[PDB]
Amino acid sequence: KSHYICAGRLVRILRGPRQDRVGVIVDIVDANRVLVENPEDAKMWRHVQNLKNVEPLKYCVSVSRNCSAKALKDALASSKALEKYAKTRTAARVEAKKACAASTDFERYQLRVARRSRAHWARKVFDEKDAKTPVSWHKVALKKMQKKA
Amino acid sequence: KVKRCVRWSKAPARRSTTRALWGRVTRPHGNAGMMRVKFNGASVPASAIGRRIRVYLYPSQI
Amino acid sequence: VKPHLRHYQVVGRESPSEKNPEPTVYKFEVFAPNFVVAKSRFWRMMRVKNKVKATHGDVLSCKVVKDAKLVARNYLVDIAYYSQRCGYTRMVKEFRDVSKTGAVSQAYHDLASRHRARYHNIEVLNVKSIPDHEVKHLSIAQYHAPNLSFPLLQRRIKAARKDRAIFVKKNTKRAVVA
Amino acid sequence: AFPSRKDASRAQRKSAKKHRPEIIVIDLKDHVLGRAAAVVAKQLLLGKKITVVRCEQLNIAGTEIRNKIKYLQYLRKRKLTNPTKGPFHHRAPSDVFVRTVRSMLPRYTKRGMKALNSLVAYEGIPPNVVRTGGRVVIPRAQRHVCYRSERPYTVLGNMCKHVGWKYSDVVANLEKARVEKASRHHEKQAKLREAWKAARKEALAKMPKHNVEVLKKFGYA
Amino acid sequence: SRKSPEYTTLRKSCAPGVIAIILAGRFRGRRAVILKQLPHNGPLVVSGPMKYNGVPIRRIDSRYVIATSTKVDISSVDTAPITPEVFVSDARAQLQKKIDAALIAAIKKDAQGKEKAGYLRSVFTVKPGDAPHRWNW
């Protein structure tokens, strides 16, 4: 279910000069702009974001409208909203591109030998479970063959 | 016809009907990532419009 | 969008004549794109109010006015505009913006849409941040509710200009072309 | 066009593997008619081979009565002297789309005829197109991002059935029979789709752990 | 100083020890290690080593090489002048193996040095969906 724009609602910036940074709505200007501040991040000082560039998250600190910029740092510390976000899967996809957009050619090789490992293991586990149950196409056709040939 | 390529005497296995025209990317063209290339000493044939052009990684800068 | 108009305080004066050995110095608030427009709107108003020309003219100052802390305020942009039929209509037009120079910019963008009036056919008077309990229209007064809470429905989430595509794979985040 | 015996003996003298060219197949369900046609008219002219599918599901903005009148104003045009030499008025949604693409091409040169014969434009999904790869989509033309949802729209298969196009019900029984068939195929292999993902979670901890915290740095766990 | 043989104008990324990508020539897409640069602003000289990817001691220039961040820190023998490469001879077959085995000696004493020996056997190709203009190397 969609998450409403309210004072305290954590938004992630979509495609500004920030592109991935989370921020807390501290005031709503009108039908298309809010004030966004995250004291934990350096680039996230109290600025004005258009609501076409925000993405509301499921987390919402209990803070009031037009906060005092020091009770905001108190509000997201007691709520632990930044740490609950930091273990979601969508936040892991944000920090994963930051490795891909900073990877050297050697650690792109390490990702390729990691994926070819897991792929080699998942296809030999799939081998030694398809001998027991005839699931795959090689094993359905041979099971419906040896029973009458 | 099989006209004469490079390494005609040194490598007679690359003797082909295949030809090739060469060029350099000179500058970008617009905001959308198109390039403005010039071929060496001539122009690209107009038969090539819509057909495959390969751009390379050499001369290298990094 | 960090607005297109700037708050210039143009200070000027007629000239030290021998008729008038010490003339009156005038202050003028103008919202202009730059200071060359801002000086000329000043000498427009010196001509149509004080019979002073720019030729017999001194601009003592033309400096910008910095804004404020960015806080959501309510602005009364008391604004006037000229149409050929029913000339010099004056409206009041309360707005809702973070800065004073942005509030006048919004006034120039809906004197342009609601009424089709351009920059030089608009004069702007007395822009002031007013409190919540003085806002009269309910289309601005509806934002003073302490528990607003609306959803962003019916959106246009576009890609980030570095990963935009032409053909993606119908249920999939791929890119078969571009 | 079936291949002739000159084109069949050379695929036996030379042992020709079965070849398929690189063909992009667009699923045009819920697309803007002229925004999809302009994306396609540029890609075809950049040398893309494009099969277009499900043209009876294209959308045109406005009331169905509005877009049906605009076709009937188009059908009002005919060469009065000899209408066999006139504008030919195609009624199929698959042929409305070929026209709308063609009117965005340089139609009267050979480069614009080589690009209009690169487009195929079926309606429904025919049996040769079904199992040839995942369909693609044009996300800048998809009616849920391009039309304001309060405004009416018009399905092209419904505008065209009331101006001609006597095969509306044939397409509706060929696509009812497909989604019944393709949902029987998809309840099948659900113990093959779950077989791999319970083997790709089991491949972890059966693989060395120094290749897993590089597989968790890039988020591929 | 420009007429001196120690005058180079070569990039700071194409240092000795830097693992390269060949991009052209016979052994394109392979990963070879940069040994040194020939005098009078000469071309680079890369060995593979041949034990890993099949690239011998060969001349290549800087503009046909992507030099990456990964070094192996060679301090090996440099007795490869501008004249073993002049008009396999048993000299070049001996000069190969004497520098070949000095590479694997220096590959393995590197920290994460077995990961780099496998890195030299892989092949760089351009996949149908990847962007080499947005990559760090």
Added chain:
RNA sequence: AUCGAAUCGCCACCUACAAGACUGGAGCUUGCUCCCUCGAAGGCGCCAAGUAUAUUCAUGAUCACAAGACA
């Protein structure tokens, strides 16, 4: 059988289907709280059949259509 060619991503995991005023599941204070599958990846492929002291590669000599092309 002329025929040398241009093309350079494979899959019996995509190749089913709707939806965008929603589309993980529920609560009731209906905009917030709560649950795990955490709601932003179709899998592979990119040079040991798989991350481990394993064994060919030159002389095709410094770019040239990749001199290869059954994945």
Added chain:
RNA sequence: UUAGGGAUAUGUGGCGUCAAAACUUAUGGGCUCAUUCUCGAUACGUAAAGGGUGUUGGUGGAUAUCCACCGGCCCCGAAAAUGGAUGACGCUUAAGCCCAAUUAGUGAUUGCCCAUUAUUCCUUUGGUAAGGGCGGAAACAAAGGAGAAAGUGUAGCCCUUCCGAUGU
């Protein structure tokens, strides 16, 4: 505003396809729905009076509701003789109208596309053209080379420099 050619940058006009450019830009604001010559849309350039409880702003009165006015877009007013034209397709989370930006409340410059224009680099040609050199400096065989004319005009005496160039 125009010698024969390049490179860069512009102007008028543009950037959904035709058709180069916003691979349909913004992390800008409003307004608009129109059902048989089919809303609208590049000036010059070839429908009015009047009407609307369509929508969107304003102004002045009065007791959450009425009253008089004024504006924007849209509709009505609005009927012709080959089939027909915002140039065509189309567009309606505009690809329409009015404002505004330039990669976006991030930290200051110029988004980019097109000329017989502009800047600059070559070559030609003509000047109310402007300067220099022209007393062979020495020296030099075959088995470093040739030229050097006191000149309107040449295959121009040889160099250097500057400006112009279309036309019945």
Added chain:
RNA sequence: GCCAGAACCAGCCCUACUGCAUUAUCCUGUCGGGGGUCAAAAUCCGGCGGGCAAGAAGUGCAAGAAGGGUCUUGGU
């Protein structure tokens, strides 16, 4: 006296790296009078106490003696 590649000079054309001034209708501090709320923080107005909002401002001027072009010139 043919075709390519790199190198290095010079010239010319690109783009990186920024200083000087200016803030005040402004920043901050508390006591008011005002607001709304479940209570109160804010918007707002006013006293005199301090001030530097400091890659701080999209405000005025900028002189910061390069990395890339040159099948955009000549040369070795």
